[PDB]
């Protein structure tokens, strides 16, 4: 019996990539072709039915199986549908879809993470013994040209047909609760320019500003105090505002570690100033070797750490 | 008489956990099976009906009872439906649902709180004398593996069949106003890493920054003035911003008490500086035993308080 | 003639209290019972019709009057409906509703205000000469426990049946433009803990910090300058963020008067410091009775004002 | 031939005034009465049809013209409808509507601007040669007695019936493309209390704080430096946050000019301090006539500017 | 064969231009006229059908093709529809639409960028061999006068009728997979007043404030320290808040480069002050030629940079 269904999915665009809710909107077309009883259309050309007569056609016994996306969040926005009825028997169901899909994303390497936009299509009411997906072909011609998003599409699409077992139908369908599933995966990487400008360069210049304190002698303590407190508060607000752009994930990201290292450098600069002020105890000059060596240690350590960082993750 | 209805609920995913509105979105499938009068299916195969033919079947007298979720917020997003009609009489209703459900949450131990995601399913128009839930089986196979939400699910779901009394039917149905109710409960705990990084570490480093003032002698008043005002304003902004992620609840949370203790420490450090400034009335220094002992009292008290706090709530 | 209709409203929950839009969401059930012409049910048992046959039944001449909420914002989300048809003629319409209702709210005593949640139900197309509300019974069993979500429910519900005249039907229906209206009112008060923690305690501690300036002599001008400018800016931002939680109503609230008094206290402290700095020369030396008396006048005045304030409104 | 249609519009409430999108939500009732061919009602009483039978009535040839709001944003929320059918032929269509309407607003005098809430009703598919609006009666009894939510209603509503030509139907119907249009206009003014408290009083007190620097001698420069930089930064953030509540327009508002003048005053105070500090070089405590005359020039100039401003626009 | 379809698009308004999501809402009317088989209308006058009979007419064999927008995001909000049926055979489909359309936008020249609002209309189910677009006419009479809502319309609308090939229909339609497409493009430029007031004037005045430091001698290190740190932090927050109004695009905009140059100037001023402080040796006046030349170089370089900048991009 099992009806062989050939599926072709045209992807018009991907957008609305919300990393907080871990959703992304997909606009495209879906074509589902199977082979039924032969028919006689007016002329050799096949007959075309637009959405509403479709009801009547399935009310008079025409078999049109309902397909459903698993990753969708809420009923996907279904546009116009159409039925092409061929004289040689093949029936084709074509519909436009606008859907908010979901997929598990891992942000450990954020903002250098690699993710996948996934479509999991699956028939309803019909198991693999009744309906089986023969082939799948994805035509991603629109987005593959330029990868227009805050993301970058890396490579062609991947297709896979699998069989998924549901235990909640075993109470009904005995030993017949396996459904055929089409899986479409699109690999993508994150472009870091926005994140550079918004968090990395601010942290770098904040560390530089903190280091500027070293090139003052055991001078007006308020000046270096202003440096220290200003820089530590700036780094705190930067860490908060940077992690506000991610979901509340127990694990730490690469941006988290970078911010932590910059925070440690700024706090170490402040503690160094406090230390060298604790050792002044005198109305003499005696410029301190501590600051003279810090003026080199801090920038050189920051530079080699940045080299290690950016050599990693890239 | 009472029609025994067997229910199986497959939960595809839980997401959209909004602690402000105390809602959470649940996507899954629902199966409701009962045994009616025998019928004649076409062929030996049981009959399958997809949503629209369903109308015709309920127009020709087929009895399909309406079930409803109590925790839902608005009409739940209903996907595709299906009826499996068996020759031996049993009818089976299978449908996908995506709903925003509600449940009373208690935030006294926030962010260490433990909550439960609840589904309250119940028939409409039919009491326990007409329709009764025989058994319930929940299949939470997808999410129980790794908990990739902002929460952590601990264990399988709990099922409960109960009888609920309604006073708004007591005005008509005397002593016959009891409805069968299925309740599915999923226990969850909150991951605190986001809250750690966003409020606790900032508060801790702000307390450290406030304590740094002790390591300046009593002469430069402005430096320690900047320290005190900077730290108290930072702690105020942190107190404000921390409760921004919670509903407006009259009661206090654990994070509230932690912030209050940190604020007390910062303000007490500032008042200590003001006190040692009150003894400046001289042209002498006499480095103050107050600061010399504070450099130990403040950090040690903060450390033992952190020990007590983090030993509690965990 | 006038058909007597008995109405019972079961309130499942009240939530979504948006003080900005002056709206609130109510989820519950509505029951409307009247006595019509007798009918012949299959068997002695009364007949039950679930939503869809309902259409068919009114297509065969069944008279089902349309009821409407006046306070509602948009078409309320109606869940499942049901008709209980008795052989003796009485009809019962039971349906679940979830609606966003509106009511004029007065925020003069904010955040100590007391408000009312109102439901104004009224028939459509039928006047008091055709349809009359006989009795009303509200069954608020779920929420009566002094529920959560920023408010406190004080007492049971109040019911009132009235007659409202419409001038826009006078152009057609002469002397027949009076409609019967059911009004359900639920008194509620606001929990102030959130508002305390978010604005009052910050303002109080800001005033305390501003007063701390007095315990510095008139010598270090910058320290007290930092105190004054920091505190006045803090109070300005606090006033802004405090009125950010209210609609643009133009009248003054209790929070407005409290913030204004705290602002006056902070600015008066700054002005006192500026005056004594203009008097650091021209007639004083190193100690001033002005500060010695301010250290008592400012805290005592603030305390007695706080006593008067908090004794009021409570 | 042309069907004379009598229209009566009851306005229940106006709310949701979003100045950013220049929209406003209007809830009310609409009545449209015309005189058609006589019919046979059951009994002498006229017939009443509630929405759903309405379909059947328009399915058997009853002529019900479609009306449309032009200013509406999206399909307006249509509640319950009703048809009153008289035996002498006259038909009456009554329906509740809730719509988000739009109207061109000019914000040059903001926040002292005067705007108009407009309803543009117009038939669809039928020109003035087939359907003509005879008269209009607006019954704004509910809301006109009081304020709205943030605005003030000045006077009753104004009505106008006009004829509008559409060029996109000129391609088909030659010289018969004129449509009758009903226009309802309600004048409104903006309440300024919120804007006063949120921007005007903050700017005024910021100018006062900036002027406080003058009452410090050419003493420790950091204090007056703190004054200047604090005040200029405060005025910058205030200007930004003030224009954040308006759409991104090209012209300047009254609030813009007020903030600009305050900014000029603050920056001039800072520049004055910088100038007198370039002349502070001396070893005497000589107080400068520049500051002594500024202590009068700046407050008096600000006061006369405030007088001119508030005398204008009011 | 190919049915020539004439299309006319009336644009009522364009609004809701969200640059973050790169969407814009378009409300208007659409008219599609073709020539079918002659019919007999009641009288010689054409027949008019209002939405609901439309169903019936397509149920009795009337051919009404479904058209679809490609740039739309989700199912467009369709208002009222209408069919004008002429006796000479021509059919006209007229409907009001309100849709959120999308178009690829390039923000490299932001905020001086030039963009285009695009509508791509295209038939469904019918290729160029079955349905062909004969002509297209856009009537943008209402909105073309104002150029309102943060943009400026430059010129009338442009049309392009093309044939687009779909490779995902080659599996079904061999050599018959070309669809006729109407493309309407409206060129527009961005109004910069809002962006001027919100970022440019703040950055310019911040550069001025930073330069003010030169007019203080090298005596009070803290005053110029406050100047430097305040100005660099202000520029950092301004850059962040400025890019907060844009999508996360890997490339840099003109506003980005302006902010970068202002940041470089401010940081260079601070570094210059630190250098001149490193020359504090020679405890006699020794005022430094560095400041004497900076007081001219910094303002003159900033002025010539502003001249080059604003002469470009304009």
PDB file of C-alpha atoms in Angstrom, chain A residues 3-4 24 26 32 63 74-75 77 80 92 99-100 151 170 173 177 196 213 221 228 243 265-266 280 307:
ATOM      1  CA  UNK A   3       1.708   5.886  -0.860  1.00  0.00           C
ATOM      2  CA  UNK A   4       5.014   7.222  -2.148  1.00  0.00           C
ATOM      3  CA  UNK A  24      13.288  31.922  13.234  1.00  0.00           C
ATOM      4  CA  UNK A  26      10.720  30.770   7.268  1.00  0.00           C
ATOM      5  CA  UNK A  32       3.635  17.237  -2.336  1.00  0.00           C
ATOM      6  CA  UNK A  63      -7.738  11.912  -0.449  1.00  0.00           C
ATOM      7  CA  UNK A  74       1.710  27.902  16.814  1.00  0.00           C
ATOM      8  CA  UNK A  75      -0.272  27.099  13.705  1.00  0.00           C
ATOM      9  CA  UNK A  77       0.546  31.098   8.666  1.00  0.00           C
ATOM     10  CA  UNK A  80      -3.000  30.055  -0.645  1.00  0.00           C
ATOM     11  CA  UNK A  92      -0.061  17.549  -6.326  1.00  0.00           C
ATOM     12  CA  UNK A  99       6.148  29.761   9.921  1.00  0.00           C
ATOM     13  CA  UNK A 100       7.975  30.507  13.147  1.00  0.00           C
ATOM     14  CA  UNK A 151      23.752  35.520   9.976  1.00  0.00           C
ATOM     15  CA  UNK A 170       0.640   2.471  20.473  1.00  0.00           C
ATOM     16  CA  UNK A 173      -2.406   1.913  16.428  1.00  0.00           C
ATOM     17  CA  UNK A 177       2.939   4.003  15.113  1.00  0.00           C
ATOM     18  CA  UNK A 196      32.524  43.731  18.131  1.00  0.00           C
ATOM     19  CA  UNK A 213      46.012  55.671  35.214  1.00  0.00           C
ATOM     20  CA  UNK A 221      44.457  60.177  44.314  1.00  0.00           C
ATOM     21  CA  UNK A 228      39.318  53.056  38.807  1.00  0.00           C
ATOM     22  CA  UNK A 243      24.626  39.159  28.449  1.00  0.00           C
ATOM     23  CA  UNK A 265      42.435  43.614  34.246  1.00  0.00           C
ATOM     24  CA  UNK A 266      40.530  46.773  35.224  1.00  0.00           C
ATOM     25  CA  UNK A 280      53.823  56.178  49.377  1.00  0.00           C
ATOM     26  CA  UNK A 307      46.135  37.426  20.306  1.00  0.00           C
TER      27      UNK A 307
END
